[PDB]
Design a protein around this nucleic acid. Structure first.
Ligand SMILES: [Zn+2]
Ligand SMILES: [Zn+2]
Lengths: 132, 132
DNA sequence: TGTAATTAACCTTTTAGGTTATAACT
DNA sequence: AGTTATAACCTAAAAGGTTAATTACA
């Protein structure tokens, strides 16, 4: 019989909720999400099992959204092809040292100019010596 | 003898202040800035003349910081060379419709991959047909 | 004239860019 | 040992977009 730690006006009751989620303009509903939900407000409390499941769904969704505009495999492929490590790739293309790990895991979207420059150099790798 | 509207503990007194400012890691001091300053806290109040002068200095500083890594003239040049309007350029290179106006005015720094892709296409303009 | 092109405030989301941890590998 | 990649966490900036206010310019 726990009370909502937020509004203090509803009880937390175990059930399920479809959770809308938006990333980079793409909308989805994460459905049947188990948790404790406040009768009164939006406060929700998930256990570890529920949090983990939920976050995995969110991570999965974002990766599929990013994969609409660039395949993580294409990025890794062009990088290893230019014989760059991720840190070397980030120095040239920008984004900070973690940049390419984030693109290649599918968690962050590269700049449109990063993608397009990767496409130019995929067909014309020798051009890297011009701008390195 | 107007009291500080922020801390209520100091009077606003007319004088000058050197104002540190940082942009994209570059630090400067905007010197001798006229205004009303609170004796107690950092609260300052500038009239229109003082605000305008100050903001012009801030805008000037940011533009010179951006110009360290990319000349606005180089950007306009490559864009008009690829026969792109700013909106057309933004669609290909990213950044939203206002992107290129912000770069070309010197107010925002383009992605390192935007700069480098602009460099590739400056020497090899025909390559735009590959990724457009 | 009025239509496209650009500059401008101004707003929210997302990456840039970096620190520190962890772990695998060389 | 240092090298590579992944991971979470930060702040500061640009991405991306809406609206308005301007400047070329048919
Ligand atoms: Zn509640
Ligand atoms: Zn004060």
């Amino acid at each position: 019989h726990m009370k909502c730690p937020v509004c203090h006006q509803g009880e937390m009751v175990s059930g399920i909720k479809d959770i809308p989620y938006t990333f980079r303009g793409r909308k989805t509903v994460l459905k049947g999400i188990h948790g404790l939900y406040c009768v009164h407000c939006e406060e929700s409390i998930m256990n570890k099992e529920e949090s983990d499941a939920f976050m995995a769904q969110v991570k999965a969704f974002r990766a599929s959204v990013n994969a609409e505009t660039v395949a993580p495999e294409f990025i890794v492929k062009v990088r290893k092809k230019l014989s760059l490590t991720q840190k070397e790739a980030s120095e040239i293309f920008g984004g900070g040292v973690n940049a390419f790990s984030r693109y290649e895991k599918g968690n962050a979207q590269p700049h449109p100019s990063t993608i397009k420059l990767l496409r130019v150099l995929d067909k014309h790798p020798e051009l890297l010596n011009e701008i390195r």
